[PDB]
Write a protein that binds this ligand. Structure first.
Ligand SMILES: O=C(O)[C@@H]1O[C@@H](O[C@H]2[C@H](O)[C@@H](NS(=O)(=O)O)[C@@H](O)O[C@@H]2COS(=O)(=O)O)[C@H](OS(=O)(=O)O)[C@@H](O)[C@@H]1O[C@H]1O[C@H](COS(=O)(=O)O)[C@@H](O[C@@H]2O[C@@H](C(=O)O)[C@@H](O[C@H]3O[C@H](COS(=O)(=O)O)[C@@H](O)[C@H](O)[C@H]3NS(=O)(=O)O)[C@H](O)[C@H]2OS(=O)(=O)O)[C@H](O)[C@H]1NS(=O)(=O)O
Length: 130
């Protein structure tokens, strides 16, 4: 683990955690909020925390992504592999509902309830920085 970038195939954007707790995607590589440090809390779970603001990516009960200043149960995600070798992150809390981390092709975050196994918006690829 060294800070990475979560580049999403669908749309080709980099996961971003704006200082205001807003999660989205951007194509600007020079954006100072796309560097993320992934912290493994166990064998299949991970923490996705911003290096620039320190916020942890989390997902509320409504399936919306946000930047939390605290590592709570809503910040833990299961990292899995698609058969095309892409990383997909499903909310450990909302695991049974099948809610993943995902970005609309236009760049916006896709709502938990609006994502599902197999989509292209949930296909993330861990790109290395420096
Ligand atoms: O079409 C895309 O732009 C694209 O679709 C997926 O990409 C596929 C490629 O196009 C495909 N190539 S091919 O040549 O077209 O075959 C192939 O390469 O595969 C890729 C990836 O898909 S695959 O690998 O899973 O097969 C891809 O989908 S996703 O990754 O799963 O999200 C996306 O990259 C992208 O999809 C995006 O746009 C479509 C089309 O939108 S449009 O351009 O605005 O028209 C979005 O889908 C449309 O809208 C949704 C929706 O809004 O929810 C669906 O609409 C129905 O359901 C809603 C919600 O209902 S419910 O939840 O309340 O029950 C209703 O409000 C709508 O009225 C419903 N319409 S109905 O079904 O006709 O009754 C529906 O999927 C679709 O509607 S429509 O037909 O366009 O009207 C899609 O969400 C969006 N994904 S996002 O990640 O960008 O957000």
């Amino acid at each position: 683990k060294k800070p990475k970038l979560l580049y999403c195939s669908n749309g080709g954007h980099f996961l971003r955690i704006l200082p205001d707790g807003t999660v989205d995607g951007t194509r600007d590589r020079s954006d100072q909020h796309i560097q993320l440090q992934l912290s493994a809390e166990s064998v299949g779970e991970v923490y996705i925390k911003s290096t620039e603001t320190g916020q942890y990516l989390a997902m509320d009960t409504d399936g919306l992504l946000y930047g939390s200043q605290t590592p709570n149960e809503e910040c833990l995600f299961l990292e899995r592999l698609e058969e095309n070798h892409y990383n997909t992150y499903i909310s450990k809390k909302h695991a049974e509902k099948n809610w993943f981390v995902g970005l609309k092709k236009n760049g916006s975050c896709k709502r938990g309830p609006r994502t599902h196994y197999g989509q292209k918006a949930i296909l993330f690829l861990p790109l290395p920085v420096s």
